[PDB]
Amino acid sequence: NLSLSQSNFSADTYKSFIKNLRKQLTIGASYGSAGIPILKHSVPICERFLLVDLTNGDNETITLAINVEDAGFAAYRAADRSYFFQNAPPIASYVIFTDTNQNIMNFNNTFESIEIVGGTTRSETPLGIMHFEASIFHLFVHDENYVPTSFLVLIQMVLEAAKFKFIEQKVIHSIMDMEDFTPGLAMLSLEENWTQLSLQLQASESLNGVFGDSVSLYNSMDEPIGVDSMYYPILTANMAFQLYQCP
Amino acid sequence: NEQCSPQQRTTRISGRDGLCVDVYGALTADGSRVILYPCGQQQNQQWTFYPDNTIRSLGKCLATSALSSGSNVVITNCDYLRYDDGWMVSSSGTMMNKSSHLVLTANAATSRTNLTGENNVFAAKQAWRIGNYVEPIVTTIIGLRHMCLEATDNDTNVWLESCVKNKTKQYWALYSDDTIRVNNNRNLCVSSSTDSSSKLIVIRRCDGSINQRWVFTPQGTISNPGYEAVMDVAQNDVYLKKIVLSSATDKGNGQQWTVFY
Ligand SMILES: *[C@@H]1O[C@H](CO)[C@@H](O[C@@H]2O[C@H](CO)[C@@H](O[C@@H]3O[C@H](CO)[C@@H](O)[C@H](O)[C@@H]3O[C@@H]3OC[C@@H](O)[C@H](O)[C@H]3O)[C@H](O)[C@H]2NC(C)=O)[C@H](O[C@@H]2O[C@@H](C)[C@@H](O)[C@@H](O)[C@@H]2O)[C@H]1NC(C)=O
Ligand SMILES: *[C@@H]1O[C@H](CO)[C@@H](O[C@@H]2O[C@H](CO)[C@@H](O)[C@H](O)[C@H]2NC(C)=O)[C@H](O)[C@H]1NC(C)=O
Ligand SMILES: CC(=O)N[C@@H]1[C@@H](O)[C@@H](O)[C@@H](CO)O[C@@H]1O
Ligand SMILES: *[C@@H]1O[C@H](CO)[C@@H](O)[C@H](O)[C@H]1NC(C)=O
Hints:
By secondary structure, chain A is an alpha+beta fold. Helices cover 36% and strands 22% of the residues of chain A.
C-alpha cells in the first residue's frame, strides 16, 4: 500500500506521497477541455477502494480505505479491528477489512457530520506534523472522543491536499516552518466547493469554458475571488482531480 | 441533471493590461466596434455566452468583420450568423473564430484601442480571461525545492529563493492577458529571452508579446504556448539562479510549479 510514516515525514516525502496518491486515484480517469482528470465512476465495489497506510510516532499503523469515486475515506483498519462510516457504500464491509472485527462509526464521512458529532470545527482544529501523528494514534486505539477531530486532521492533510495543490502547499509550509496552522477561508473554500467546481468544469464544456454558476474562492487575504469560468489559475493550477458529474 | 447543460451565462472579458472588452459608446448599430476600456458594471461590457457559440452584449453578437487579418471585431445582428459555427475559446484563453481561425487581439495596450481579428501567434495581446473577476491575482510562485520565484537585480532577473511570507519581491500579479507581472511594479512582466543566444527567463517592460504569455497548466507547468516550451530551473539546480525556457520533459522536477495565493 502507498504509505506515509512519521519517522520519514519531510516536505519531499509528503510531496511524493500526495503525488503518488493523485496518480493512483486517477488511474483510468476521463479528461475534459480543461485537462483536469475526472475520477472514475460506477466502479464495481470490489475495485472501488484504494488502501493507504499511515504510521505514527509509536511504530503503529492504520490502513485507510479511500473510495476512488470521490476521494473520501470509507473505513480504516487498526490491527485486527476496523471501523466503517455509516455512509460507506453499503457492501463495503464485504470487500475491505474482511478478516477483522468490524465496527460502525455512528456518523457520516462528511465534514458536516464529523463536526456535529465531535462538536468541533475545522477552523478550530490544528493541522501539522504532530497533529497528524496524534490523529493516527487516536484512530489506532479508537478513542471515541478523539475519532472525529482526528478525521478532520487526516482527511485534510491527505485527501483534501490530494484534491488541491493549494492545500498540499499549505501542509508543506507547515512542515518546513515547523508551524501548525488552522485552515482559513482559502482552504475551506476549496474543501467546500470541490464537488461544485467539478460540476461547473464539466458543464462549462458546452459554454466555451464558462460556468453555469459562480464559485467563491478565498485567497489568503480573505478576499473572495469569484470563479465563474475555467480561466482562473487558482482553479486550473490548483484542483488536481474532479468528481464525476456530467457526460 | 439539467445543471450539466447551462442555458446561458453573463460575464465580463478582460485581457491586455487588465482592461475589458467593451462595445464603444454602447452603440447598438450593426458593425459597432469593440475596444479595450477600463472595467466596470455597464451593460456594454457584459457578455452573455450561449451553447450556440455566440457571445453577446446589447442583444447582439460578437464577430469578426473580414476573412483577412486586421479588421475590427464588432457586434452585429445575431440572425446574420445563423449558419456560422461561431467562436471557440482554448484553455489558454485564445478566443478564435472557428471558421477563419482569426483571434481576438489588442494591437495596443491603451484604452479605447480597437480590437481586431488577427492571425494567432499566441501573444499576450491575444490572451483573455472570460470572467467577472477581472482583477489581477496576487500570489507566490513555488517551484523546485519548495522555493519561491523572486524578482531580482532591480526587477530585471528572476530566480528561486527560500520562501519568505513577508518578502515583497516574491509576489506576482497574474493578469488577464496571461502575463505574470512584478507585484509592486505592474509595468514589468516575466519574459522569455529576446536574445537568441540565451534561454534565460527575465523581467522586462510589458509589451504584449509571445515572450510574455504564460499558461499555468493543470499538469503543473508554466507554459509558453507560442514557443512550445515551459519554464524550468537550469540544470535542476536552484543555486544556479537561472530560470530557463525548455521543452517539456519528465527528467527532473524543475518544470513543476504551484500557485500559492
Ligand atoms: C478604430 O475603428 C474605427 C472604426 O472603423 C476607425 O475609424 C474609421 O476610420 C475610417 C478610416 O479607416 C473612416 O473611413 C473614411 O471615410 C471617409 C469619408 O469621406 C473616406 O473619405 C475615407 O477614404 C475613409 O473611407 C472609408 O473608406 C472605406 C469604406 O469602406 C469606409 O466606409 C469609409 O469610411 C471611417 O469613417 C471611420 N469610422 C468611424 C465610424 O469612425 C478608427 O480609425 C481612426 O479614426 C477614424 C475616424 C479615422 O480618423 C482614422 O484616421 C483613424 O485611424 C480606428 N481607430 C484606430 C485608432 O485605429
Ligand atoms: C468568423 O469569420 C467568418 C469568415 O470571416 C465569418 O463568416 C462570414 O460571415 C459574413 C457575415 O455574416 C458573411 O458575409 C460571409 O459570407 C461569411 N464568410 C464565410 C467564409 O463564411 C463569420 O461571420 C465569423 N463569425 C464570427 C462569430 O466572428
Ligand atoms: C456606460 C457607458 O456606455 N460607457 C461607455 C464606456 O463603456 C466606453 O465604451 C466609452 C468609450 O469612450 O463610452 C461610454 O463611456
Ligand atoms: C448520512 O448520509 C445519509 C446518506 O448516505 C443520510 O440519509 C443521513 O441523513 C446522514 N446521517 C448523518 C448522521 O449525518
